[PDB]
RNA sequence: ACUGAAACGAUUGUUGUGCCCCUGGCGGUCGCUUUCAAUGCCU
């Protein structure tokens, strides 16, 4: 499989934005009682039941873009820096932090 | 530069501590192992 994808593929990143998009689509199914929470309560929201023309209302949970891509990314920056490619000791040449001015410009992550 | 670029309401926490299905209660009451029988027949 990866042999034959490797074709569709940017050969390394580019300046401009082109308009090739790879989309995963995923069920992400809760395994033991997650807390999708903000302001105290699990967040929520009104919407309509399904697409087939309803008149009928449902309340669903929300779970944010914060609360999915925030635990993503930062299990990849655990894994670069247990692969040394990256580190957390403000004396080395190859430091990045999360959020700071000390984010690196450089490192699969940024 | 989309009023833009990145953006975890988070961290920690035992529904806990004590508690006797407990107390009282007769398997009880009535009941004939009974009824009939030649140690017998001869010397």
Known sequence: MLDS???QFQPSF??????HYVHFL??????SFPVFQ???????????AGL????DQLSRLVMF????????RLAGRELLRN??????????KNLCEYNGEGSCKQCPDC
């Open 5 to 7: 994808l490797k074709s």
């Open 14 to 19: 580019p300046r401009l934005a082109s308009g």
């Open 26 to 31: 995923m069920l992400r199914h809760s395994q």
């Open 38 to 48: 903000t302001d105290g309560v699990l967040n929520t929201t009104r919407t309509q």
């Open 52 to 55: 087939l023309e309803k008149t």
């Open 65 to 72: 873009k914060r609360k999915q891509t925030t635990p993503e």
């Open 83 to 92: 692969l040394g490619l990256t580190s957390a000791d403000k004396s080395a």
